[PDB]
Each structure stands twice: as C-alpha cells, then as structure tokens.
C-alpha cells in the first residue's frame, strides 16, 4: 500500500549506504517492519566475470550464492536479512524477457516498451510486497531503493513505471526525492549548489515533480542558502534538510530532532506512531553515540590492503568492527600499507619507500592478511606473516591467506622450498592446496566453494568457540574456491598443528591452529561481516582482552552525568 | 475562483472559433455568466504594420480601436461584448515590461525571467476576473482562451504560470485540455491518429498531465479507436469525445446528449445547475437547427472576395448572415468570383477566367462590393457595380465602395473622365474622395476614421431606417480612412442623389442613396457583423422581402410536430 | 575573414578576464592586431537602475558613457581601446528590433525568430569587423568574446548564429571551445571532472562539435586524467591544456612553451608568423615575471573596502597598481577592513571587533578612501581620514571622498557642526557639495557628471603634475554626480587649502590640496584604472618615493645571471 522510493548516488562507492539506512531504521524504531529492494542499472551480475574486488565489495553475508555490494549494513542495522530475490539487476530481468517472447504467451506479437516493459516491473514489486523475511508477517510499507547510477539511457522506462503506481492510488502514498550534490568552491566560499537547479529540469522533462528536499554537506552552513532551494522547488522553507555527515552514522538522528521531519511524514501518509519520548525510541542510539566519542588509545596497528586510495576491500569492514570494539574501550588506528610495492619491484628500484614500512609493522600488535588479485602480489604476503610469528606477535583469522600460511610453515619448521604459489601457475610437486570444486550434491561441476554449509567443530577449549556459549554446530558461509588435499596433510598431524574445526565429512580442514603460539587464529570464513553491535567478533575481540586484561574500568566511572 | 483554459488551434484560420464558442454557451444556458479572455502568441497587433486583410479578419464589431480576429462569434452567440482590454497579445505586454525595468520599481535588480514574468501574467488575470461586461456583476467562472498557435519557444513560461494557480487551490478547479488533430490518409483507411501520442510527450516534457479528451473529426468513426486514446491518457473509455464538425455550429449540441459530458463537469467542479429538461435549455437551439435544414431555393447569388481559396474577408460574414435569412425561408448559393484576374491581365493574356465570371451575376439578385489591396485591382471593380445598376438590379451597402461608386456615377450621368482612383495616385484634379484624417477631439493628426461615433440620419422613409422601429440616433462603427469633401458635392445635390444619413456635424456624407432606383443601399459602416439571429440586417433582408413579397408561407405549415 | 569565439565563465566575477586576455595578446606579439567584441546575456546595462557596485566593477576607463565590467584589462594589456559600440548587450539589441517592426521595413509580416534574429546579429559583427580602434587599419582576425553566463534560455539563437558563418566558408576559420570546470574532491583525491562529460552532451544536442580542449586548475595534476578527456572528445592526446592559474597573469605563457599550442593554431588557419626566438616575442613578459617574484617588504598598509568577501570594488584595481609598483621594488600588503561594522553598530553591541581595527591603521602608512552605498556607512568614513592627517600620515587621492573631506576640515580647523552628509538627507544649511547636474552643452537635464572632459590645471610645482613631463591639459574622466558650489568656498581660500587643478570654466574645484601637509593628494578622477605597466600612477607611486628615497638599489645588483 505504501511505496517510497530511495535515491542513492551516482557512483557505486561514494556513501549512499548511510543515507538509505537512515530511512530504514525510522519505521523500525516506531514498531513497524519494512524490507529492502534495490536495482542495479548496469549490464548483468557484478559477481560474474568481473574481478572479485575493484569497485564493489562482494561478499556472502547470509546468502547461498552471490550478493550485491551495499547489503551488509542493512542486516547489521535493521532486523531483516537478504536472500536470492533481493539482488535485482538488469541482467536478471533479461533472463526471462527473452524466454517469454520465445516460448509463446502473447501470441508472438512484436512489442516495443509499453505496455510490456513498464508492466514487467510490476511483477517484481507486488511479489516481494507480501513476502518479507523470517521475522515478520506482512510489511505495510514497501520501500524500493535505487543504487548504482541514476539518469542514463535505461532511465526512460523507470519514469513511466513510477507514475503507474501513483495515478491509481491517492497522493498520500508517494514522496519523490531525487539527488543533488553540493559542490565546494576553491576560490570564493559561498555554497552555490549547481546540481540542484539541474535536477529539477530533468524531472520536469519526463513527467515528475519534486516534493522533498535532498542535500548533502559536512558542516552546518549558514541560513543564506536555505531559502534558495525553497523558491526553486516551491516547497516549505522550514523543511530544508542540512545534513552534515562526515564518515559515521550518528550524524543523522541528531538533525531530525532539530528541523522537524519525524512528525511530517506521520501525518503525510496517515500512519501509526508509538510515542514515548520523541516519536521513535532514541535512547538506544544515544548510548552508542556518546560512549563512542569517549574512548582513545592510539595504538600502532599495521594493516595490509591492496592499493593506497579508498578501495572496496574494507569499506564495510572497518565500520562493523569499530562498534564491537566498544566493550574494551580501546581505539585501533588503521594505516595504509600497499602489498604491491614491497617485493622485488621496490628494493631493486628505490629503497626509499621500503625501510619505512618495516618500522611500523614490527612494533605493532595486530597484523591482518590481505588477499590476492591474479599475479599482482605473492612474495610480500609471505614475509609479512612469518615475521610476526617469530616476534611473538599474535595474528587474526582472515580469509584468502590459507595458501600462503602453508608455505612459510613448511620452510621454517621443515624446509620444503618446492611448495610455492599454486593459484597462479600450478606446476609444483608439493602442491598442498589446489583448485577442487564441489563433487557432492547441490553444485555439480566446476563451481565455487560457498553456500549454506554446516560447520562442525572438533575440539572444545579454544579462543573462537568459547565466545558462542559452547556451541556444537554454527552456520557459517565461505567465499573461496581452493580446497586442502586430505592426502598432503601428513606433516601437519605429526607436529603442533591441530585442527579445532572441520566439516561434516571430516575431510576439509577449514580451521587450523598452531600450538605453542599465545594467540593464533586462522580459518576460512569471514567473521568481520558478522560483527554485530550486540555480539562482538571472535578474533579481533579476543586479542585485546588477552593483551592487558583490563576489566576494572567499568567500576571507576559510576555514571558521572546521572 | 474557477479558471478553465481553452485550447484553440495551430494556425489562425482553421476553425478554432466554433470549438471555443461551444464551451462558452454551456454555462450561459444554465443561468450563469462568464467572460472571454484570449492571448495571441504572435508578435503584436495584426492591424498595425501588416496588411488589413490576408490571414486574420480584422473588423470593428463594437470597439473603439483595433480588434483581434476571432471576437465576432463570441458577441453574437453569447451575451457579452469585447473592449480594449480583451485583445491581449505579446506586443501589449512588452510595452510595460521595458518601462518598469527602466524607471525603477523593484530596485533595478537584474534577473532572468522568473519570478517576474510568471507573476506579471497574474496581474492580467486577477484584474479581468471581477470586471466583466455591461450585463453582469461578477462572473464566478473566468475562462482563459488560447488562440493563434500552440507549441512555440515563447510557450515555456506559459506552462509554469498555469501550474501556479493550480498548486495553490484544490484539484477541482482546473482541467487540462491540449490539442490532437486526427488526419485521414487517402491510402489506407484506419483512423490512426498521430498527434495524439505526440501531444502527451510534450506535456510530460514540461511538467503537465492530460486529464480531458480532445479530438476533431468530420464523420462518425468506429469504436475500435475510442479505447486507443483512453489507455494512452489513463482516462475513462466512456468519456471520449467524437465530434464530427462540418462547417456550422449545430453539430456540437447533438453529441453532448449522447456521450455524457453535460453532467460530468457539474460534479467535477461543484457548481450549481438549473435543471428543467436536460441540464441546460436546449429548446432554444433545436428551433434554429432543424428549421434551418428545411429550406431551399438555390438562387444565383454572386459575391466578390479577393482570391479563390478560403481568405479572411468573409470567414465571419457568411455565417452571421445565414442565420438572419431564416425569416424568409430562402437559401442563398455562394460562389467564388475573383476581381484580380479580370482587368487587362486576363483580357490581353488568355480570355478564359473573365467571360465565365460574368455568367453568374447578370441575373443575380444580390451583388456585393469587395475592397482594395493597394494596387491589385482598380478597373474591374468599377465595371462590376455600374453593370448591375443599368439592368435594374438592386445592390447592397458594403464598405470600401464609396471610392468607386462616385466614378461610375460621374461618367454615366455626366462625363467626368478625369475623376479616377484617388487611393493609389492622388494627382487628378477631380479628386472627390481624398485622404483626410480626424481634425476634431479625441484623435489628433493622421489617424484612422473609426471609433465610437454617433450617426444621425436626415430623412425618414427609406429601407435602412424603418427596420429599427423609426429611430433617431443609432450607434454604428466604421473602418476606413478616406472622407468625402464637402466642396466637391455640388453635382450630387442638383441630381437625384439624396443623403438619407449624415453625421453630427452635417459635413461627412457617410450614407448616400440614388433616387429612381427600386432598391439602392450604400453606406460606410458594416451591418453584416451585427447580423444577430434575433435582429436581421437592414440591407440583405430588405432585398428578399421586396423581391416576391411571399408572406403566406407561415400559415401553410401550422406546426406539423405538434 | 577569421572569427574565433571566446568562452568566458558561468558567473560575472569568477576570473574570465585573465583567460580571455591570453588569446588576445597572442596575435599582438606576432605582429598582428585584433579587436575585442563581447556580449552580455543579461537584461541591459548594469549601471542603469541597478546599484553602481555590487557584482560588476563599473568604471569609466576611456569612455564617454557607461561601460561593462571586464574591459579594463584589455586596454592595459593590449594596445586597443573601448568605445560606445563595445558594450553590446541584450537590451541594446531590443532597442531597434521593436522600432523596425513598428515603423515598417519588411512589410510588417508576422514572423517568429528565424531568419530574422540570426540575421540581425550579422549586422553587429560585419560592422565592427573593418572598424577597429585608433591604432590599426583593418584587423584580419575578428574574435568575439562571450561574457556573463552561458547556456540558458536565450542561448538557442546564439547556436544557430555561430554555425551560419561556418557553413558558408571553409573549416579552417573556426575553432569551437566551450567551458568545463574541474571540481576538486574533499574525501578521495582523484580529479574526476563532471562538467566535461556534461558539456559534450549539450553541444551534440544543438548541432555543434567540440574540437579544442578547455580546462582550469591551480596545480600541475597527474597524467592519469589527460587521456580521459581525449577519448571523450576524440581529439589529440598531446593537445590537452593543463593551466595552473592561481591569481596572476604570468601562469599562462609558461605553459604554451611546454605542451605545443603556439604552432598548432598557425597551420590550422594558415596565418603569418614573425619568428625570432619562439614564435612570438617572450622577452617582454619574462622581464616582468621573474623580477616581480624577487621583491618583498611586508609593510602594514590598512585599506578600507566595503564587505569582507571578494567584492567588485577592487577586482581590477589591485592588479594594475601592483605592476606599476615594481620600479621601487616594494611590496604592499592589503588587508580587509569593513567600514559598515565600525560606527555605532559595533561599540554599542560588542567591542571585540572594534579595538583590533584601530591597532592596524594607526601604525600604517597608506590609508585609502572607500565609497558610499546609500546609507550603509557615513560616520566611520569621517573618523578614518581625520586621524591619519593628525598623525602625520599621508593619504591618497580616491574618488567618492570629497563629500567627507570637507566635513572633517570644517570641524577641526573651524567648527561647522551643521555641515553633515548631503548625499543622504539634503536638509542642512551649510551644504557645501550638493547634487547639481550638467547645465552646459551635450548633457541636458538631470544627467551624470562624466564624459570626455578637458581638465586644465592651475598651479605648477606639485606631486600629481611633475610626473607627466610638465603638461598643460590632460584628458581625464570622472564618475560622480555631486558638484562643489562656487559660493560656499569662501572659507577654503582664506586658509591653506589651495586648488592645483580646476576645469575649463574655473568654477568646479575638482582637485584640492591642503598646504602644510607633507603629502596630501585629493581629486575626483580615478588614476588607478590608468595604471599602465610603462607609466606609474601619480598618487600611490609618489608616496613610496618620498618615504625613504632609496634609489641606490639598481647599482647593487649588476645582473648576476647575465
């Protein structure tokens, strides 16, 4: 009955995840439940023949196949999940449009775009309307998000389809909101916005009328430009949104309580409201926002990524791990260490940017594991993990590192030099980890080792099992394609390399652990994406607790501002 | 409070006057009163530097200055008149926009076009809203017509001005209606309309939404195309207007009583209605529509225009004179006689289009007088009037004929050959009628002899005075610039050329009459534009009555449909 | 024969004067001569009903009426001048379009826009083509500039007019160049330009094709973005312009000698070239660019403007005075002192921003005079000039200060308190300077005291006469409307207030001087706009020379890098 469109950004990787998540948690705090349906105006699936990481962070956060790139913050913030019917893209629609015109359902008539293409989208909205997730019956408000890009060639049938749902019902069910970025000059200083007056012309040229106010800034600007957008849109002057988002999420609820937008949408669509303190419950967000800005540590933590700019390997990783680190009242400092310029391409050229890198990882405490993009780095990732183990520095369990962990262990404890990289040129004789697809049920042939798999542990007392209340079968997902051979693990059992985690067939060693080390965590799944604010992650939380064991801090405050 | 826009046509002179007159007489028959405000998207007044007649029929039907071109049918059908504030055009607006920006009323702020042009049109609508004509107090419905062309570059601020009055009030006060012509190809046969789907794209490209149904045809089409426009406009299939207008006005009320549009607009805007037989009174129009198609005569009537196609010299003249001819139950057959190719350009070249035109006027009963377009005809118009007077045939009083009537009278009764055309080369010595402007009050300098002037007759018993109930001072308007000299009328008084009509100064002989002729009418005003359906015109009605004197026809019928 | 369009900016006051001046001095250094024709897409003249200064710097630099806002740098850099046929705007064209359609030259035909508007612009270009300035015969290259804004509503006929001159001649006579600003990110760092890809769509949507490369930056960016624009425009990759303009003019010729654009336009249009060192003469600009960055002083110079941001009262004043100050090898530091918050609106509110202003003007050396905007400051301008005279600090001759100079002189030397501000409320009895227009020839009625007037001095030995080689009649222009009464100057002759400069009638005292002061300059004309690089200005140059008298510096260098 209720359909509110959500406009993201113009490029996948700018910051549209925090904007769309603000409107989703509004109705969740008032006692209602909604969904999350998006659309990618591209070509096909991003997780197909494209690189695993370059522009979009593709993972497997609670899904049996492939995901999008901006669906990790919805499950962590809201109480909903994502399935296989949520990654709607242009490639998935074309799989059935060509099939329906070839089988024979409309007498084989030659169509164009109307009323067929605009009506085909109606089947994708009315089907996910009464089918939410495992946590609600039927959501009354069904919002539709718009990610990726906006305004292109395929943008014509999108406008003709939005007016169909509006002309059939009343005017109190839709609120159009486009997008208008606010540029910053370098010579003057007056916030003269340009995309604002240009976005109105595009809406009037297709049959739309803007009603809401869209803006994006970083600091509270003056009131001399708030009346400029009101006359250009013929809206209310006291309804201008002045969002000053920087790089977090607590810069949004503090604004709705000052302008006056929490009560405007209630009487606009005639919906219920559970009033208590201020429309929606705010005490849940104030306890996590004020307490966050009261901790500090400035500890040297050297991490390894891929490049030097803002990549897509930690866009949603550094945000989820920060909320779960508030139980220890410690702050971690993230640096930028590129693994490409570290091998022979730096020592043989200029040793200027080579000596300064080792002076920040030896005196650190937590060293992470990067990944691997074809043949763009394989020697520097080996020397980065063996040096931390010899200098009694603990490590964490990061995926895409099991291929290099078995190389440094066979050369230091034994002396197997033939065992090298097997994911580039499989030609060595001591290839421990090779490429073997799934030969069981479900997936047949050369597929990928992922999906809804049951992970069963083997031992008991450890560091990644006692935090779950002593379980027995935890549901975890993976994202890899290489498996360990059960015939080449003969030298791993006669040493101190136990296995505190196996599979349901007792063949694949997905979890490995080295005895004697004070804190050694290594597995295959990704516990960083499951970093809930109410449930800390196994690896990164256990390292800080087992460092200083400072638990007498909560009894020192005693609520000063009570 | 009520504002309904009226869309004319795409060219001045296609038949947009009969369409706009249908919506005007709808509320007049229900007991209400409205106005008529139009706007031309052209340059300025057509009667300024352009030719007096070529594309727009310019007259002086109840006005003290210049008129438009489509204001004659409104005064004859409805009970309202037109003044000097009704010929609104783009040239009149520019006379004050340049003046206000040069003097200094808005601090001289340099702007673009908004919000100055959109607010300037508001002063032209809210001022003529409560100021109707001499016949009502305050009209509740104030409609605004749109003549000339549609879909021009200058039409951009017109779209932003129509939505301003709608967004401030409720949705039950405006009904958008564009235009969509229906062409009929001579190759296929299916009425596939093209401007219908093209007009919807233009409304969506500016910010409008069509709600009504606009169509234009000349024959009842099938029902297979009635549902084609409904799905393209999201309207009701039972509200499609299928008008089959031919060339009159009675082809409109016969359709509203079959589809169902006389009661749709009543509940749409919440207005009053005086029900009696069928919403509005229809017995007044049925007595003039069925009775018209029951008379016949096929009498040879010769008229003179200018060209052979549909010009602008008789567009609104042949329609008003036909309704007033129903009292005698006689039909007049109109032909096409061109006065251009009749002089030495045809007799010396190919004598084919000359001797044929004279075969339809020697035995006719009503011979009219054309006009004058610079130097495109001056000899053929002289031999056309003197030939009918010698063969005892009656004539009519048409303007632009006093310059040629004094030439044939001085050569036949006397022998003044020097007296020739004075409006082309004023070099003759016997120039009777010359160019003399008004030297009295009101108009100063070289102006035009027109305006609200008082015409006082001189004699009594005649043919153009006894029909007005023996008056004494009738208000008539003229449209000329040449006057008769009071010093060169010495030979007109010593013969049988009396004057049964003078002016208020007893100097200008505007009405002349030749004694001895059975029916000779000649004046300067235009009685054809004042041909009311309840008051026949002086000249053309007195010719048929004095022809056969058949008055025993009304006693033969006796109301058959009783 | 040659017509090259020049694209300015998107707002009148961003920095389009230095960009258009670079292409003008290119052909002047090769032995050719060009002109300077611009067009304002606004309403009319800014100096008409709008404020005299707010967004555009309006002056009188060699003109007998009103000027534009970006015509002062052309006369100072190039060897051409400006007249009355150079300030072409949209208001000047409409003065004759309405007149030609009302008189009657094209038979009064009702037209629309073409082919009339596109052909009317041809008369403004072909007339100024063979009529340059007083310094050349006939310029072979006739460039047309485009100031103000670009791309709006009136920009449609401008596109149809540019292609008319191109389709009639060869393709080697025009070079299209639009505009595309390069934005700077605030989070990432990659210079991703957005208006570049958007400007190509606008040119392709009207009938144009971009061929040149337009860019604007401030620092040498990387080469990773130079190949991004080449593929979007299908041009040469080695022809991308990377201008790093900051705030001067010497940041342009140093780039043309590195990329390769000085020889590309020579063979593109087939023109002559006087080769000597590098196409055009460069030794003239290198002597003024290297020597400028080798002087320093950092002297406290307190100036008074109007606001706190970049206004239009010193945009072209601080640039011309800096080049003429290189003869003394001294650098002047300009500050920002607002005259609005200095009167009773600051001492009665908060004295925080009041005490810090007096601590920078008492220890300074050169105090300027601001102006006057109605009633937005009149008391602070009086106390700012009387304090510098008592503290033996010299002043300069700035206009819009003669009304306040006579107030402080009558209260300190005598005691006339009734003499106050006359430009606001003319009700006092001792009104010395009132508003009296020109009552002589040329200007009649209430006009403005400006134009080509002859200024004749009276005395001989002074500080603003000996620098012109002892003249006798210098041609200077003014820009004011208030005149001095010859009957109220009785107390100025009996003291030490001589007049070293009068007019041609010996009535108007345009130049005043106070005896006894070491350096007191006061007049009415504007010598700052005439600050040529080869001829220093009278007032600001004489203050530095008469300060320390340091002339033995040229004999200390001796050309080290010879």
Swiss-Prot record, chains A, B, C:
A GO cellular component annotated for this chain's UniProt record is: cytoplasm
Say what happens when this gene is deleted: Larval lethal.
Membrane-spanning residues where? none
Q: Please, which domain of life does this record's source organism belong to?
A: Eukaryota
Q: Name one GO molecular function term.
A: CTP synthase activity
Q: Ranges for the Glutamine amidotransferase type-1 domain?
A: 300-554
Task: Describe which pathway this protein belongs to, using the record's wording.
Answer: Pyrimidine metabolism; CTP biosynthesis via de novo pathway; CTP from UDP: step 2/2
E.C. designation(s): 6.3.4.2
Which CDD domains does the entry mention? CTPS_N, GATase1_CTP_Synthase
Q: Which Gene3D superfamilies match?
A: 3.40.50.880, P-loop containing nucleotide triphosphate hydrolases (3.40.50.300)
GO terms for biological process, alphabetical: 'de novo' CTP biosynthetic process; CTP biosynthetic process; larval lymph gland hemopoiesis; pyrimidine nucleobase biosynthetic process
Catalytic activity as recorded in UniProt:
UTP + L-glutamine + ATP + H2O = CTP + L-glutamate + ADP + phosphate + 2 H(+)
Question: Which Pfam families does the entry mention?
Answer: CTP_synth_N, GATase
| Tissues where this protein is expressed | In ovary, expressed in oocytes, follicle cells and nurse cells. Also expressed in larval and adult testis (at protein level). In larvae, expressed in lymph gland, salivary gland, regions of the midgut, testis, optical lobe and trachea. Isoform 1 is expressed in adult testis, ovary, accessory gland and head. Isoform 2 is weakly expressed in ovary.
Q: Name the catalytic site residues.
A: 399 (for gatase activity), 526 (for gatase activity), 528 (for gatase activity)
* Keywords (A to Z) from UniProt: ATP-binding, Cytoplasm, Glutamine amidotransferase, Ligase, Nucleotide-binding, Phosphoprotein, Pyrimidine biosynthesis
Task: Report the sequence similarity comment from the record.
Answer: Belongs to the CTP synthase family.
Function text = Catalyzes the ATP-dependent amination of UTP to CTP with either L-glutamine or ammonia as the source of nitrogen. Constitutes the rate-limiting enzyme in the synthesis of cytosine nucleotides.
Q: What is this protein called?
A: CTP synthase
Q: Which organism is it from?
A: Drosophila melanogaster (Fruit fly)
